[PDB]
DNA sequence: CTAGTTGATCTCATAAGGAGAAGGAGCAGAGCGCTTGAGC
RNA sequence: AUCGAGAGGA
DNA sequence: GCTCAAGCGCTCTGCTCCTTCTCCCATCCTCTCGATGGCTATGAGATCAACTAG
């Protein structure tokens, strides 16, 4: 189980050609945990794999524990195809040859982007035009991207439909074998296989062994 | 009652294409008072052929 | 350019309404994807 | 001079 | 045992009721009665910019 094998599995999993090439392909920190056993490990190879530069791990804001992942050079690509032709493409080019090689942090606090990063307090609208620059606060603001809005709503509206069905289950167990074989509802777009993962990182299920497979149950 | 009547038909003016038309523009009578007549020149008549 | 002087200027110091419009609550039912689910 | 109150006239 | 059904819970209006909230109440004129209204000092340091000579 490594962090550098476990990311790449999920990104494969993505539906890229559902969101129109726009928003880059994210995989969740929830997921994460669900390839890789140790848990206590998978930060530590995710953090020095931050700050190696090769993965951008964006905080989402579904629950406390969202942590979302964005492929570095896919997030680099798809900023400016989507910034150029606009208002705000032009300092969002600086934020991106500057901040982004520069820094790893999830959230810039005011002195750190206008003094660090040179940034003065007229642009900073258009970072905020289309998804680079969040809201955490007066003083700091997580980093942001672009689009992310039609993710996280299809993306709450399967964790709820698959757990739910999970519940509507005879005696409230649903064979994880009966998930793949069975057909993916309608509901939830994002995949069934994309959402199984994140209830195994997020507890809400737990991998139950046994003669027929494997299991998954609500916490008792 | 005469101060909402008035608020309300303040600005009604009959305009120079002899139409009626508010503050806005909108018309509200083609011509005035449906014959385009003002009221101090009229006087009760008697139609010789209806009765 | 330099001191010395004169005012400004400040600071700190001791003690037997209403009609209507707008929001929200609660229930009530329609519809529909779903999940079975069992009769021919 | 300001506010408020009261008494009044058409 | 293979497809139409029967239900089914969840969501989306929506429909009416109850509650709450803001505004509104003729014009002009005269007069009087009352209420109101504020009023620490004096001196010490220290800066500063303008005259008044140099």
């Known amino acids: 189980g490594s962090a550098r094998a476990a990311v790449s599995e999920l990104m494969q999993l993505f539906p890229r050609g559902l969101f129109e090439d726009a928003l880059p392909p994210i995989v969740l920190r929830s997921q994460v945990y669900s390839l890789v056993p140790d848990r206590t490990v998978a930060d530590r190879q995710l953090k020095e794999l931050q700050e190696q530069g090769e993965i951008r791990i964006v905080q989402l804001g579904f629950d406390l524990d969202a942590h979302g992942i964005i492929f570095t050079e896919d997030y680099r690509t798809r900023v400016l195809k989507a910034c150029d032709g606009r208002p705000y493409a032009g300092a969002v080019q600086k934020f991106l040859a500057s901040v982004l090689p520069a820094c790893g942090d999830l959230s810039f606090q005011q002195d750190q982007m206008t003094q660090t990063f040179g940034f003065r307090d007229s642009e900073i609208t258009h970072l905020v035009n289309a998804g680079v620059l969040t809201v955490r606060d007066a003083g700091s603001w997580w980093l942001a991207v672009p689009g992310a809005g039609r993710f996280i709503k299809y993306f709450v509206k399967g964790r709820q439909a698959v757990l739910s069905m999970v519940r509507k289950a005879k005696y409230r167990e649903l064979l994880l074998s009966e998930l793949l074989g069975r057909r993916a509802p309608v509901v939830v777009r994002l995949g069934l296989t994309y959402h199984v993962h994140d209830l195994i990182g997020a507890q809400l299920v737990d991998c139950i062994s046994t003669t027929s497979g494997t299991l998954l149950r609500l916490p008792e | ?51």
């Open chain 2, 1 to 51: 009652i005469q101060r909402r009547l008035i608020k309300s038909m303040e600005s009604v003016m009959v305009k120079y294409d002899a139409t009626v038309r508010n503050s806005i523009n909108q018309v509200v009578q083609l011509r005035y008072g449906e014959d385009g007549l003002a009221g101090e020149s009229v006087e009760f008549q008697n139609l010789a052929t209806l009765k």
